């Protein structure tokens, strides 16, 4: 596939190779804070990252992924809307060319500067490849980024980006603690949706935190120096790697909080 975020290969083209792009539970969506309803049936959200084992950072030509050892139950997400145990396998971000855009989800049509996706797969399906074939296969924890004060726990990510500037470059990224990327509050919205990149599989329980994290202008400027292209190819800055809001269709967004 040759999908990306340009005029010629961007989100409006994706449906030709990935017809589910026009499906019934696509992501991201706008979160209308007034029509999202408090659900008392939601159990407490459990983010258990104490034993998280990061291994590597990869520039995959669409974003950069911090990859985890998911060979055991070391870093898991449970509770909230979730049945059973979801294992952390990677995180990445989507971000803008300028501070006024970059998030995939929106909140009353507001766009944040960036959005962090912590990707977990349901352990009842045994591996990630099997889990993406199921409607409850994945849980993605989405966290908004606004530009303000630096996020101390982000800086180790920022400082390695120089070593993975281009598509296909990776670097060792051991002993990174993803708990440093969380906000104080775990208040969330949740809805059923999809991967936000091809293959756009309708396999995700979305859990979007209400409280954004603050990152510095200097931190997000370093995200924007990455390249979509490979080494020795024409430089295309890795910016505006976000899919816009998709139709909500027959879905309800539920709030964990009143
Ligand atoms: N924007 S999104 O909705 O959160 C979204 C979330 C996940 C995906 N897709 C994947 O994670 C597919 N995939 C990678 O890219 N890396 C792998 C994980 C790292 C461990 C080694 C296996 C490879 C993997 O399984 C696409 C969109
Ligand atoms: Zn994502």
Structure, described:
It catalyses: hydrogencarbonate + H(+) = CO2 + H2O; urea = cyanamide + H2O. The protein is globular. The protein contains three helices and 15 strands. It is 7% helix and 29% strand. The strands form two sheets. Strands 2, 3, 4, 5, 6, 7, 9, 10, 11, 12, 13, 14 and 15 form a 13-stranded mixed sheet that branches. Strands 1-8 form a two-stranded parallel ribbon. The chain has 258 residues and is mainly beta. Bound molecules: the ligand NS(=O)(=O)c1ccc(NC(=O)CN2C(=O)NC3(CCCCCC3)C2=O)cc1 and zinc ion (ZN). Zinc ion (ZN) binds next to β7.
Overall spatial form:
globular
The helix/strand order is: EEEEEEEEEHEHEEEEHE
Bound molecules: the ligand NS(=O)(=O)c1ccc(NC(=O)CN2C(=O)NC3(CCCCCC3)C2=O)cc1, zinc ion
Classify the secondary structure makeup into a structural class: mainly beta
What is the total number of structural domains?
A: 1
Alpha-carbon distance between the two ends:
44 Å
- Compute the number of helices: 3
PDB class: lyase/lyase inhibitor
Keywords: carbonic anhydrase inhibitors, metalloenzymes, organoselenium, LYASE-LYASE INHIBITOR complex
Assembly: monomeric
Entry title: Benzensulfonamides bearing spyrohydantoin moieties act as potent inhibitors of human carbonic anhydrases II and VII and show neuropathic pain attenuating effects
